[PDB]
Amino acid sequence: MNPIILIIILMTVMLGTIIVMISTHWLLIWIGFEMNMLAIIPIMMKKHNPRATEASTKYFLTQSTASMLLMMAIIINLMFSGQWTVMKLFNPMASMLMTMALAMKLGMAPFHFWVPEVTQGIPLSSGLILLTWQKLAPMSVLYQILPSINLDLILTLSILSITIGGWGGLNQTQLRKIMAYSSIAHMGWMTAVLLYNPTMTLLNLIIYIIMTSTMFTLFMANSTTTTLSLSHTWNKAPIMTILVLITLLSMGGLPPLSGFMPKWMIIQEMTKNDSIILPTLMAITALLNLYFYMRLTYSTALTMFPSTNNMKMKWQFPTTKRMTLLPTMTVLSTMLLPLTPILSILE
């Protein structure tokens, strides 16, 4: 791919997301979603492998069904309201259709089946672009329509996403599938608090974006795709293993790291509304996310798996990858707890 064409395609993705974010018309939301899908399709086809083609086909079919359901919801709201302003919807059927459309777009369970599939078949940079940038626009659309969101449906989707993400990440050996199931659990966390306080949804979105960016940047820097190469990383560079141990510690919500910051705040907005069973259940389920993070830290940094003879050659060459914002994202994702009230800038 040409650098100019790749740059133009990336700005097209950014323009589509911005168009969804800044528009006050439903047709422009739909237009931005199609812009985003059409411009992100070739990034998944960067290597021209059969797995990339199948992943792009599955992503295309799921996004097409989601966009068509979104247009059906827009048309129903047009009929029953006579206007296009992006605000609360004026039909429960249109609200339900739009909610399941955005759940299919975000990868919420039980529409999650493409997320561990697709992320396995695409490169690491494209998977990072997916799992971080593609989740901004549907979360904005969910933010704007929360007066019409059914509570039962969104809480069912949240608990299903958290449980299925934990039980799915409990099994994998590949890193990309682990990050996919972790993403599913995290969006269950973010949507569980949406109807009570969306500022916590914004805070959890930002923290999840920083953590996923740090982990994917570490994986790109070490060129690791399975757990065994991540185990091998201890011989080549120990500082990378220390960084992935600290980041995986923070991703599990272990205090005093910054990953304790979102979910705890979420509990603080759900015991105010006298809902005690749900946050306790969600923390108990997120213990499984902590479990497979602990398994990864056991394999990587807390022990030393055996290495090979050719690794000695890799001792003679310094790394030359542009590890952009890796120290900043490592610091920001782990020592951000003593600046917890800064979330008030998102209110």
């Binding site: 990378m240 310094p318 120290p327 490592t330 610091v331 020592m335 800064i342 008030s344």
Partner: protein, 120 residues
């Protein structure tokens, strides 16, 4: 929650009313913590590229500290502004609606009765 408050002056990082509040001091503990975070990020940047951590790249570490302190100062100013906005809205809503917040008759302990549960 505050979505209707910042609906007539949109996309303003720090509005005019934010200038009525005292700015944070340069010796703030939070500003010092953010500068320490910037220094730690500079040390990590030195470490992951196989450089002497405390020796190499003094200008890079200084730029890290300065950029972190700049961003943190602006973020802290916005945070105190929005907390002041929260308090102002709360007090205005309490003052505007006196019937929903009745003053309670604050009794002393000679009139109130508390059940005694012995430990034995």
């Amino acid at each position: 929650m505050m979505t209707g408050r910042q609906a007539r002056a949109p996309l303003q990082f720090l509005p005019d009313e934010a200038r009525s509040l005292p700015p944070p001091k340069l010796t703030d503990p939070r500003l010092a913590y953010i500068g320490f975070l910037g220094y730690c990020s500079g040390l990590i940047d030195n470490a992951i590229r196989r450089r002497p951590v405390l020796s190499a790249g003094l200008h890079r570490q200084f730029l890290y500290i300065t950029s972190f302190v700049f961003v943190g100062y602006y973020l802290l100013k916005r945070q105190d502004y929005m907390y002041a906005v929260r308090d102002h809205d709360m007090f205005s809503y309490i003052k505007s609606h006196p019937e929903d917040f009745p003053e309670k008759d604050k009794k002393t302990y000679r009139e109130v009765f508390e059940e005694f549960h012995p430990v034995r």
